[PDB]
């Protein structure tokens, strides 16, 4: 019965970020933090989500430089969050980030679109991390299914479809049937066709797959979305 | 368990409407026809749904005049579709429509907003029809649960929330808990906040409630939405 | 510097349809009717639009068979509305509709997508009708300019972009520069990216091109959109 | 006329932010940066926008503390960007921010919703800054027009309507007729009804007012929005 909400809580007033976390806890929504650089705010968010009990399921380092990796990875370890790595600057920073995260006993997810899926798969076997595939074209999804069957379906834990196109719906259904490792599929809570979103949510829940909503807008907009102005 | 798709299949090319019915049957989506007056197209569509195996779960008369009721009601009875009545011109035209449909042994759903909800609950009791409540204001949910507990909770089978606003979410979550009769909830497939739509779909499916998607645009647009050009 | 609103005024409570026309007149919006078959309601809408002063700029026959062409065209001639023809069953029915419409002295626009653009340009050349080119693929745009230049830049009066996709924007800007005949561009008022809609509207208004908004949803929804519960 | 695009370029891969700025320049769109804390990335964005010719018209400090004000203000002054202030932590942080920005010769716009409009109006005249009003309820507009006429329509340079609801459209039109200081109106480029968006853009341009589109989503999403892959 899990629903994730990917939020970007490093901007705006911190009271808004905290209102997002409280409202999520109240609505049974697990939170993934998308990071924009503020590690002090990160530590305060970890503390206050503990106080509130909000489940910070994970944090995402997206294009983060090497000097920022270690404090973030240490905070994740202290508070028991999964680490997602995305758009890593170069192969050495990515390798270092996985190495330190595994040294800290972290659950590590590596995001990959088709272009560097092979690369990411390699790292995922080398350190024992899972992969989340990023699809924006139906063709990319078929190719990813091929490559993942060839490298083992239990390495792919999630799929992200940010432009959910009508022509993707059926292909995604079939892909999921061939990918028993996929635990979460992520859709845009901001710009996805509501009818396709309802249909795909229905399909995912029936298959026992969790739904993740991407909401990486300033926390003020999310406080409005969750009616958390109290 | 079920997903309904309310479509407006009058207008434009009939091959597009059939492509819609084909795509729905393939995707496990039950179809409700929103009628605009065309009784020949209604009969042709019923025939092709017979032919293809498509389930036409229901038909909607919206602001329908008296001269058009009987041919439509006869078609619904012949092919086994539920009759939804909305925005009936005056209480007598509604009376005639319910009476004729019940002479045909039809499932009758009466849409109602709050201001004339009481009337419709009464009428539904007079003829053994169910009611679908229209919510566009959070206070309406409290008032509706009241009036429905007053007239018996088994008379309310559905809720339609066409502007699904953030502040309604939690109130809806509870109101459904106080309305064990509600078997279907309807959302806009065109303009609903996708994040709220995902959350509300998850909640409904977990409660064993069906989701209906309002998609009353020309059939060519629905053909694009279901990627049904093939 | 005009704004058109393409509306589907059949199938409502009809008081909603007049409410739509009233609000459009108030707000400086020209109305184009998309027809779904009900010729009596068409007659009443023309009558009350006369009473209110509302400008029904045009009406759209979308997939009409031969027997429906003449009564509709009679109404268009009687009240002075331009005729848009789309999805004609065959070139012979299309010819019949254009022929009758010209015998009544109507302004005629022929909608065409890429596959049968040339044919429609030919017909428009034969009868002095204008063409509206339908875009759903970025590649189409260059081809349209090709096909239009072979027949003359004044024959194409409009463009319709039903899914306005990000890659189309710049290509559309240049294509519009290559086609001085374009007097109107049509966007989806329902499912267009608002940022892309703002940009393209700005570009058009700077070039003195009118904007058309497709809003072929039930008239109750258009009443909600224009807040016309007067 | 001008079109603004408020983007959140702190986060994700920096070349995505560069791709956004290049596409903006190519498409004739002025950029307003919504800041999330990364001041080194801010300096590099300023540098790259120089290189490309992109106009960084403005930057937004949203709930920023006092110690982050001065370096950000220095970047704005050095590169010629207006300073936007919103959701300031306390009245003193706001006072100091306006003080420092004016000491460096900066154009300062202060955001206010109805609830702290008067306060912000005061501050704006005390230091010579303009105000941008935030509207999310049709009722808020009557009250704002009142307060602004009482304090002078030359103080109101902008309006932001993030939930642009149908009932607001006509009221907004009427308020705009009474607010000749309004040079920019800001809409949500993400979740605003497209038909209403077109109507309002048409009306604003006819009155010579610029449109600002809010797109504070991560830069890969904005790179997708433009065709800058």
XYZ file of C-alpha atoms in Angstrom, chain A residues 1-3 5 26-29 166-167 169-170 173 187-199 201-203 205-206 211 213 215 224-227, chain B residues 1-3 5 27-29 166-170 173 187-199 201-203 205-206 211 213 215 224-227:
76
model
C 0.000 0.000 0.000
C 2.837 2.428 -0.704
C 2.685 5.767 -2.475
C 5.997 11.604 -3.346
C -0.949 12.323 7.817
C -1.833 11.069 4.315
C 0.206 7.885 4.464
C 2.613 9.221 1.844
C -0.584 7.699 -24.739
C 1.462 5.265 -26.853
C 0.604 2.973 -21.729
C 0.245 -0.487 -23.290
C 1.970 -2.735 -19.096
C 4.830 9.497 -12.902
C 4.734 13.294 -13.059
C 2.245 14.687 -10.570
C 2.507 17.999 -12.366
C 2.073 17.424 -16.075
C 0.751 13.886 -16.667
C -2.505 13.253 -18.505
C -4.960 12.579 -15.656
C -6.804 9.785 -17.517
C -3.576 7.955 -18.328
C -2.453 8.538 -14.747
C -5.638 6.966 -13.326
C -5.403 3.978 -15.686
C -2.210 3.741 -11.229
C -4.994 1.140 -11.389
C -2.730 -1.237 -13.310
C -1.721 -1.245 -7.748
C -3.247 -4.433 -9.166
C 3.266 4.486 -7.450
C 4.479 10.963 -7.901
C 6.405 16.836 -7.336
C -1.096 24.162 -1.593
C -1.474 20.760 -3.286
C -1.891 18.885 0.035
C -4.097 21.612 1.590
C -11.939 -3.064 -9.496
C -13.503 -1.499 -12.637
C -12.538 1.574 -14.589
C -14.664 5.963 -19.222
C -7.761 -2.225 -22.149
C -10.515 -3.456 -19.813
C -12.239 -0.081 -19.564
C -6.895 19.939 -2.869
C -9.060 20.864 0.117
C -11.679 18.258 -0.852
C -9.279 15.291 -0.723
C -9.340 14.464 3.006
C -11.593 10.307 2.058
C -13.028 12.471 -11.790
C -12.178 14.708 -14.746
C -9.800 12.927 -17.106
C -9.046 16.222 -18.759
C -8.099 18.708 -16.059
C -7.638 16.944 -12.746
C -4.478 17.640 -10.826
C -2.626 14.432 -11.777
C -1.011 13.996 -8.336
C -4.354 14.210 -6.516
C -5.868 11.916 -9.142
C -3.240 9.265 -8.438
C -3.719 9.551 -4.680
C -7.432 6.486 -7.327
C -5.175 4.610 -4.902
C -7.542 5.287 -2.020
C -9.161 1.033 -5.330
C -8.004 0.072 -1.842
C -12.989 4.946 -10.748
C -12.965 9.139 -15.851
C -13.501 12.249 -21.084
C -5.394 9.962 -29.658
C -5.529 9.483 -25.867
C -5.843 5.702 -26.165
C -3.364 5.584 -29.055
